[PDB]
Amino acid sequence: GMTEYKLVVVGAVGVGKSALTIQLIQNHFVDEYDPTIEDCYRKQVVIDGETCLLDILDTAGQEEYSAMRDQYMRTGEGFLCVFAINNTKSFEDIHHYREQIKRVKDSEDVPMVLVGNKSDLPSRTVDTKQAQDLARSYGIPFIETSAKTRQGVDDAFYTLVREIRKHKEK
Ligand SMILES: Nc1nc2c(ncn2[C@@H]2O[C@H](COP(=O)(O)OP(=O)(O)O)[C@@H](O)[C@H]2O)c(=O)[nH]1
Ligand SMILES: *SCc1nc2ccccc2[nH]1
Ligand SMILES: [Mg+2]
């Protein structure tokens, strides 16, 4: 089979995880999608000439059993850590997602990309500089996105695939 990249989208409720995923997969903006639904999605794409499958888990937070969270973290190869540029708490929450994923995978080298979503809104509490400072501390890419206009969306997911490739070649 063609290579499949297992991607996991994490972040506080309301940041745009579902909107980002649906924009990536279906090329439309869905402005109301139940915040409590956690589902997988698939898309066959070409990234730098490689035909591959994106197998994406759109997370929704707590699980019936914490074992289910640990399971998807171990299964996932790369993580989109999403905050919204108008939600400071969601930005602060990134520290917890970073820690938890590393903790479950028992790894210091987990492919991740920092994503600041809702860039189409002038209303902003997290400046680009602040997010750059955090991404610098982590040594991971940082991309501002709009699930509404599609700006940065392919970049966010394709960058995560590229980070996974860098991890695999070691
Ligand atoms: N303006 C704007 N609204 C967005 C964007 N992404 C998501 N939203 C809205 O933010 C709300 C939460 O989005 P959702 O995808 O359900 O967030 P999730 O809980 O992280 O899955 C919805 O009302 C979406 O329409 C975006 O990039 N721009
Ligand atoms: S629902 C199929 C599925 N489960 C996943 C876990 C982590 C990353 C991708 C996944 N797809
Ligand atoms: Mg959602």
Side-chain angles (χ1 to χ4, degrees):
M2 66 177 72
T3 295
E4 306 185 5
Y5 295 101
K6 292 171 175 61
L7 312 182
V8 181
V9 185
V10 306
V13 68
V15 301
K17 300 181 298 293
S18 295
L20 280 168
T21 302
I22 295 168
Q23 187 58 272
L24 178 75
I25 302 285
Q26 303 176 7
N27 295 83
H28 64 101
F29 176 56
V30 175
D31 59 22
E32 195 153 318
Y33 187 80
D34 192 321
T36 70
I37 296 171
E38 174 167 291
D39 280 338
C40 306
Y41 295 82
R42 299 169 68 89
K43 195 185 184 187
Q44 182 177 309
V45 295
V46 184
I47 301 175
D48 312 314
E50 182 185 66
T51 297
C52 58
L53 176 85
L54 310 186
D55 172 9
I56 302 168
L57 178 61
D58 174 28
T59 71
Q62 302 287 338
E63 300 285 3
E64 190 191 357
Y65 300 108
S66 68
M68 291 162 69
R69 173 202 65 208
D70 296 353
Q71 178 78 13
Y72 76 65
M73 291 180 173
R74 294 197 182 93
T75 295
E77 296 172 272
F79 302 75
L80 274 203
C81 295
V82 186
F83 70 95
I85 65 159
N86 61 344
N87 178 349
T88 294
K89 177 62 161 56
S90 74
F91 181 69
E92 289 168 343
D93 289 347
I94 297 293
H95 300 286
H96 166 66
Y97 292 111
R98 173 90 177 158
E99 167 200 279
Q100 192 168 237
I101 292 160
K102 289 174 61 172
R103 189 160 287 173
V104 170
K105 298 185 75 60
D106 195 29
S107 175
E108 299 190 306
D109 188 16
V110 182
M112 299 193 204
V113 171
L114 186 66
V115 173
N117 192 49
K118 311 198 185 179
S119 72
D120 57 284
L121 303 176
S123 186
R124 172 182 292 265
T125 63
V126 183
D127 270 23
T128 299
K129 173 196 168 288
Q130 298 174 281
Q132 290 169 335
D133 289 343
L134 184 61
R136 179 180 66 247
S137 82
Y138 290 166
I140 69 178
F142 164 58
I143 296 160
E144 288 196 354
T145 60
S146 175
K148 180 168 186 180
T149 70
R150 216 162 179 290
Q151 187 163 291
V153 173
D154 284 338
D155 189 24
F157 287 89
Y158 290 6
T159 293
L160 183 58
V161 169
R162 296 175 187 119
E163 291 294 282
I164 292 163
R165 294 172 179 162
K166 287 179 174 68
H167 177 67
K168 288 171 113 171
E169 69 174 351
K170 291 182 173 183

